Amino acid sequence: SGLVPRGSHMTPDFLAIKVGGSLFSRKDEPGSLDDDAVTRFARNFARLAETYRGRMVLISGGGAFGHGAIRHAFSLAGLTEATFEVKKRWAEKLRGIGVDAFPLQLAAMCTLRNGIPQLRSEVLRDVLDHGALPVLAGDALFDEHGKLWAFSSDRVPEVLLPMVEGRLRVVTLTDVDGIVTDGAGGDTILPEVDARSPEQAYAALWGSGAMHTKLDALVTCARRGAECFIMRGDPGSDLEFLTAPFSSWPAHVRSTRITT
Amino acid sequence: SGLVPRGSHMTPDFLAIKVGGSLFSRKDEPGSLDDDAVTRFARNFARLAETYRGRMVLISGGGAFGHGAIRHAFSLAGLTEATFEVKKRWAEKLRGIGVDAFPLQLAAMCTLRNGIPQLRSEVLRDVLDHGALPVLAGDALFDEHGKLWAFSSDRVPEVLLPMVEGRLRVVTLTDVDGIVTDGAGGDTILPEVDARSPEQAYAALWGSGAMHTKLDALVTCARRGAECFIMRGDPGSDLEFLTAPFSSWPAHVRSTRITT
Ligand SMILES: Nc1ncnc2c1ncn2[C@@H]1O[C@H](COP(=O)(O)OP(=O)(O)O)[C@@H](O)[C@H]1O
Ligand SMILES: Nc1ncnc2c1ncn2[C@@H]1O[C@H](COP(=O)(O)OP(=O)(O)O)[C@@H](O)[C@H]1O
């Protein structure tokens, strides 16, 4: 294959940034989006998108829209409509501050075959090549038998693996600083996880599901070369350091980093 | 090529039914959908969809959502969000009466190259093969230079031409009985138009734009074998005759038929 230089010293070629629904919605409130949170995140995502023009996707968690859309197995089709709404809210906000943000329906581009997502549309690569920011989300995907399955926003980065050349960095922003070991309301963050043998990270989740889906996806991505992070999102936080080699990140940043 | 039997005696293999925004919305009222009209059309479309299971698409006009979305050339991106909403309203209504209706974002599946729409996603054919009803609409499409263009719902049938095997029937339901000749508020319907030389139909539109886009699309489709109709939609009308060979249609039906 092509030898790809990789390491903590290296700059990513591509950023897949996933923003958790817990950060901008409330499950106690169907389709409450927090517009202030969306507004402030959007400003920080826009700076990333300018640097990584054509080299970034933003993936939204389904939040309140999602959880109600999966709360007659064709009834899951409603999910694609609920996640489109969230994409629309991000994209609208981004375009309002000068970003060329375009929502794409993953269900129109991707199907499942033997449980593995298959990118079936060339449009995503074209949109990136034109310098636009795809806004993606979880979705209802058809499998090879015609059955719909809820495909989490956390697994969307897996879809990029065959498409992205060079070094992919995947960042999953959530409401915790990473994978915590020793307690549900517990003890320290696991800073590093080796995707080749991540048994200790899975063991920490048992100690205290959503997080299990995240780990599964980011291990999958890391086993194909990606550098992956689970870390805390905050609408007003500067994110410029996500452009930088990991060894150059500021000292205050906490995360769980998943790599091979 | 494969010789395809065709004629007024023959049954269509595929139905592309387009429902005009004038039939279920009002341009004088931004995003007024007429829910009663949607409800009643949906019942008639559901009967078609059962017969043409896996062999039909429903295409919605953009109505009030559309016209406001096209009323900073990346600002057209808002169109894809406005037409997704209309797809969602049809699909939701259809699923409520037992149809496996799934909205698909044309912009996630199709791009323009030298002005010709190019189906770039295999998902549409898969959804049909699974026996589902794609719900489609007009959209903002990217061209090969990265420019967005508003692609009318009336032109969506063109996208099906390379994909559909056998005899395609395209039916564009609007607020007039067909192409009227001799007056804006004028004289008789043109019953037949030969797509090879449709100069008389274009001349009738000058006699009294929207209709020009319809003619252009249906001539394009007819020149590749399709049997096309412009006729009046009415939410409560039975549509079962659209399953039948043209020579067997009831005598009360008025239309403009476009064929080679
Ligand atoms: N070992 C663990 N480390 C960190 N978080 C955990 C762990 N086990 C369970 N969680 C839960 O996972 C949540 C993050 O996943 P989730 O609610 O799906 O986030 P998002 O909305 O950001 O997708 C945390 O709020 C936490 O309550
Ligand atoms: N020669 C013609 N024959 C029929 N309709 C015409 C003609 N010229 C212009 N029109 C206009 O085209 C309209 C249908 O196109 P449009 O408003 O785009 O319909 P839809 O909302 O159903 O797409 C008619 O209401 C009519 O007012």
After what residue numbers is chain A broken, C–N > 2.5 angstroms?
71, 208
CA atoms within 13 A on the CB side of A159: 29
- Ligand 1, atom 10, lies closest to the CA of A211
- Tokens 């249906």 found at: B218
In sequence order, which residues have a C-beta less than 8 Å from that of residue A216 and are 6 or more positions away?
A: A155
Q: Cα(A196)–Cα(A219) distance, rounded to whole angstroms?
A: 8
Is there a contact between B58 and B136 (Cβ–Cβ < 8 Å)?
A: yes
**Way the structure was solved:** X-ray
Q: Cα A95 vs. chain centroid, distance in angstroms?
A: 20
CATH value at residue A134: 3.40.1160.10
Q: Which residues of B41-69 are buried (b: 16+ CB within 10 A; e: fewer)?
A: bbbbbbbbbeebebbbbbbbbbbbbbeeb
Would you list which residues of chain A are within 8 Å, Cβ to Cβ, of chain B?
A: 74-75, 77-78, 80-81, 84, 88, 91-92, 95, 100-105, 107-111, 120-124, 126-127, 129-132, 142, 145-146
Does ligand 2 come within 6 angstroms of the Cβ of B60? no
Sign of the torsion formed by the C-alpha atoms of B229, B232, B235 and B240: negative
In sequence order, which residues have a C-beta less than 8 Å from that of residue B218 and are 6 or more positions away?
A: B157, B170, B172, B195, B226, B228, B229, B230, B258
A62-A65-A68 Cα angle (round to 5): 110
Q: Cα(A83)–Cα(A67) distance, rounded to whole angstroms?
A: 10
Q: Coil, helix or strand for B139?
A: strand
Residues of B in contact with A120 (CB under 8 A): 121-123, 126
Residue A254, Cβ neighbours under 10 Å: how many?
11
Nearest to B49 by CA among B127, B141, B123, B107: B127
Q: Coil, helix or strand for A170?
A: strand
Q: Which amino acid is at B168?
A: L
Q: Which amino acid is at A144?
A: E
Q: Cα(A42)–Cα(A56) distance, rounded to whole angstroms?
A: 14
* Cα separation values, A217 from A36, A111, A113, A195, A213, Å: 29, 17, 16, 11, 6
Please name the member of B95, B130, B142 whose beta carbon is closest to the beta carbon of A127: B142
Into how many domains does chain B fold?
1
Please name the member of B107, B123, B145 whose beta carbon is closest to the beta carbon of A111: B123
Q: Cα(A130)–Cα(A178) distance, rounded to whole angstroms?
A: 34
A26-A31-A35 Cα angle (round to 5): 75
Q: Which amino acid is at B235?
A: P
In sequence order, which residues have a C-beta less than 8 Å from that of residue B203 and are 6 or more positions away?
A: none
Would you list which residues of chain B are within 8 Å, Cβ to Cβ, of chain A?
A: 74-75, 77-78, 80-81, 84, 88, 91-92, 95, 100-105, 107-111, 120-124, 126-127, 129-132, 142, 145-146
Burial label, A15 (beta-carbon count in 10 A; 0-12, 13-18, 19+): buried
Q: Cα(B70)–Cα(A51) distance, rounded to whole angstroms?
A: 30
- Look at B74 and A100 and tell me if their CB atoms are within 8 Å: yes
Nearest to B157 by CA among B230, B206, B97: B230
* Cα separation values, A226 from A41, A160, B85, B144, B157, Å: 24, 10, 35, 30, 41
Is there a contact between B187 and B246 (Cβ–Cβ < 8 Å)?
A: no
Phi first, then psi: give them for residue B122, nearest 5 degrees: -80, -5
Task: Output the six-digit token pair for A156.
Answer: 């969307």
Q: Cα(A24)–Cα(A42) distance, rounded to whole angstroms?
A: 11
Q: Cα(B7)–Cα(A49) distance, rounded to whole angstroms?
A: 55
What is the experimental resolution, given in Å to one decimal place? Answer: 1.9
Q: Cα(A137)–Cα(A83) distance, rounded to whole angstroms?
A: 6
The H or E element that residue A116 is part of is strand A116-119
Q: Cα(B210)–Cα(A204) distance, rounded to whole angstroms?
A: 61
Is there a contact between A167 and A157 (Cβ–Cβ < 8 Å)?
A: no
Helix orientation angle between B78-96 and B35-51, rounded to the nearest 10 degrees: 70
Helices then strands (H, E): number in chain B?
7, 14
Q: Which residues of A153-183 are buried (b: 16+ CB within 10 A; e: fewer)?
A: bbbbbbbbbeebeebbbbbbbbebebbbbee
Q: Cα(B250)–Cα(B244) distance, rounded to whole angstroms?
A: 10
User: What is the extent of the structural domain holding A111?
Assistant: 1-260
Q: Name beta bridge partners: A142.
A: A148
CA of B211 to the centre of ligand 2 (A): 5
Q: Which residue of B has its CA nearest to A124?
A: B108
- Ligand 2, atom 7, lies closest to the CA of B205
Nearest to B256 by CA among B222, B228, B220: B228
Q: Name beta bridge partners: A119.
A: A110
Q: In which order are the strands placed within the sheet that holds B101-103? A: B101-103, B133-137, B56-60, B14-19, B168-174, B227-232, B256-259, B192-194
Nearest to B106 by CA among B52, B55, B160: B160
Residues of B in contact with A145 (CB under 8 A): 130
Q: Which amino acid is at B187?
A: D
